Design a protein around this ligand. Structure first.
Ligand SMILES: OC[C@H]1O[C@H](O[C@H]2[C@H](O)[C@@H](O)[C@@H](O)O[C@@H]2CO)[C@H](O)[C@@H](O)[C@@H]1O
Ligand SMILES: OC[C@H]1O[C@H](O[C@H]2[C@H](O)[C@@H](O)[C@@H](O)O[C@@H]2CO)[C@H](O)[C@@H](O)[C@@H]1O
Ligand code: CL
Ligand code: CL
Ligand code: CL
Ligand code: K
Ligand code: K
Ligand code: K
Ligand code: K
Lengths: 376, 376
């Protein structure tokens, strides 16, 4: 079980590749094992590996968005990684779960992302602690013609409205332990339906504009016409550039005392079943996911990582670090793919005045029949 | 006209880069000019070039989807390319137009794509020539709960329903010659409303299922439950493997005696304004888009190219070659980004029974509104 001469890794982008080269160069000085890096987009790595791995041209470790976890495993491409408690130490717990399928840890998280609550201090001086407070700010600051809104988020997209519709006891697929049951949908629960009725109420009160897309909301927020905006960290720098000290960022507030959890997206390192040096591949994977490495990663890339012990020096990103510890993984199973469009359609219908129970009942029916078609 | 030591090109993906190293290895033997290839995905190239070009570290030529032509030019990143009549010979005419902005040719088309009409010969023996017989096939082969449909396409998505809604004299943005006028929209013209009513009638007659997504439609077609399916060429191998000689492929039919024209998508090579060797970059661009190079390309990649003198050996792809010469470029201006979601929403509403004139009137007003906010 001694060292091989080389280990290959599939990195997502030229930017990350340049960063992991530096890191792996140090790995080579420490261990003597050379590391070959290949730039393959994460969106193309799963298809590519299914072809290259069986022919001996695949990598020892590769990189994917966590929602591909079940599919990667089911195809016999992603191998189980057995880890020590000491090796798991410092990793975001829900991030690990996001990369766990059939009760097996299939990857280590490198990058995590969620939404958070941005606010314009010139319009909202204090960080909203409750949803009732966010609503109160919506009521005060929303002006009809002036394009001024107290509260915005892309409520027609399930990704964004998720935390406003699903509480801790609600679910998409029922979890009978770690196993999502694909035949038990919670999309049309009494509680989700009530939250969806509230969402429609926000549309009825004029708090959420029907015509605006997520990109319009971004523009409006930058223009200084929006008090509160729930979105991802993608435009942090330009929001900081535009607002300076007036840019506020906070975690999602509590909803009736229970804290809101946005979707958690995770991207990270998988072990190839076709790797012939699984011990050392794992060793390299741990080295590139160490506190040291991922701290340098957050410093140099301004992204939140899968390590809770990594600390950005940007207080705005510190908020997303916290939010990442209080979030819910997008189900990592293939059937989750069937959920997005019907819930998106339901959300569009809700915004247009459709009875929310009917909208969600129809989405649930549609998801059920689509899963059967694509996954007998 | 005196050669540089090296030329740099940004390629979209590892697979394409492997193909262009071989071509450029030959280029270097002919000219003596070294070529450096870097793998940067086309969705990341504008942003990357925006930052690297000014620092003297950008490429000589880069690769984008034609939809970014206007933006690339407005930011002073893409340079005009002066071309001979003989240098233009063999290029798909609409593909060139897709890459032409402010009356300037800004790129040469490498890859093109449109939808076409697939049909299962066990259900539909002959290639349908007219929309009227597409419908007749729909009336005859659509059966309630056997999940059998004579006709399918993702009518909720504007990219797919476009040819069914817009005829030759209809338009998104009015073309005052070659340049689009962002303030004159045609999305709600009488003729388009009329086609939208026809589309609603296909939902009312049960020809198009409301619950199905594109991915479901793909599944149903592969199960042998669908007579006719309008979609792109992306799964052509899977369909061939499944049906063999029973896979029919034809161009979109005539509608009222006129050719239905789907959207044309083009991807290709732009010339960086920051290149210090524009003459020779142009030379390299012409070499990598020659009949010889693109013929080799279609052979190894199974993609349709921007050259009409390139012929695939696959008869199913020959159909796509022809379709690409009878298509309409997606408007290549930034304002087109505001069009997609509102038209998608209107299509969804139409599928749900909303009055099509209202649906399209609201989309039009929303687009007008969103364009003003994002481009003031
Ligand atoms: O349309 C459904 C779509 O939603 C999610 O995509 C997110 C993405 O994760 C974020 O990075 C950001 O761009 O917002 C997107 C909104 O769609 C799912 O992750 C994706 O799988 C799904 O198709
Ligand atoms: O958001 C809509 C989207 O429409 C077009 O995208 C097409 C794409 O060109 C095809 O390759 C295929 O995958 O269908 C896509 C839509 O489902 C536009 O190209 C794109 O700009 C636009 O965002
Ligand atoms: Cl509350
Ligand atoms: Cl000439
Ligand atoms: Cl006809
Ligand atoms: K944003
Ligand atoms: K689906
Ligand atoms: K397809
Ligand atoms: K938009």
């Amino acid at each position: 079980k001694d060292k091989p001469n080389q280990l290959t890794m599939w990195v997502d982008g030229d930017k990350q590749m340049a960063f992991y080269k530096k890191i792996t160069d140090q790995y080579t000085k420490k261990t003597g094992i050379k590391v070959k890096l290949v730039n393959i987009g994460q969106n193309d790595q799963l298809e590519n590996i299914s072809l290259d791995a069986p022919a001996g041209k695949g990598p020892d470790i590769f990189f994917l968005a966590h929602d591909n976890t079940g599919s990667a495993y089911l195809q016999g491409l992603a191998a189980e990684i057995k880890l020590s408690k000491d090796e798991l130490k410092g990793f975001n717990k829900q991030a690990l779960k996001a990369m766990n399928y059939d009760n097996k840890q299939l990857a280590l998280p490198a990058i995590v992302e969620t939404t958070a609550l941005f606010y314009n201090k010139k319009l909202v001086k204090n960080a909203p602690q409750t949803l009732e407070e966010v609503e109160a700010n919506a009521a005060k600051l929303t002006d009809s013609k002036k394009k001024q809104y107290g509260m915005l988020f892309d409520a027609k997209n399930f990704y964004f409205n998720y935390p406003f519709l699903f509480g801790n006891d609600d679910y998409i697929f029922k979890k009978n332990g770690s196993e999502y049951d694909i035949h038990q949908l919670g999309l049309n629960s009494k509680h989700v339906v009530k939250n969806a009725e509230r969402l429609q109420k926000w549309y009825d009160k004029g708090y959420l504009p029907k015509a605006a897309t997520h990109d319009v909301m971004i523009g409006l927020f930058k223009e200084g016409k929006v008090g509160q905006f729930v979105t991802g960290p993608w435009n942090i720098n330009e929001y900081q550039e535009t607002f300076g000290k007036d840019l506020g960022v906070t975690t999602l507030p509590t909803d009736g005392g229970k804290p809101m959890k946005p979707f958690l997206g995770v991207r990270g390192w998988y072990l190839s079943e076709y790797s012939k040096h699984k011990y050392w591949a794992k060793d390299l994977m741990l080295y590139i996911t160490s506190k040291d490495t991922l701290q340098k990663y957050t410093d140099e890339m301004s992204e939140i990582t899968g390590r809770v012990d990594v600390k950005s020096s940007n207080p705005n990103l510190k908020v997303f670090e916290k939010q990442a510890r209080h979030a819910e993984p997008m189900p990592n199973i293939p059937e989750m793919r069937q959920v997005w469009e019907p819930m998106g359609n339901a959300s569009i219908f809700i915004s247009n005045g459709k009875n929310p129970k009917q909208a969600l009942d129809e989405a649930t029916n549609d998801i059920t029949q689509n899963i059967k078609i694509l996954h007998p």
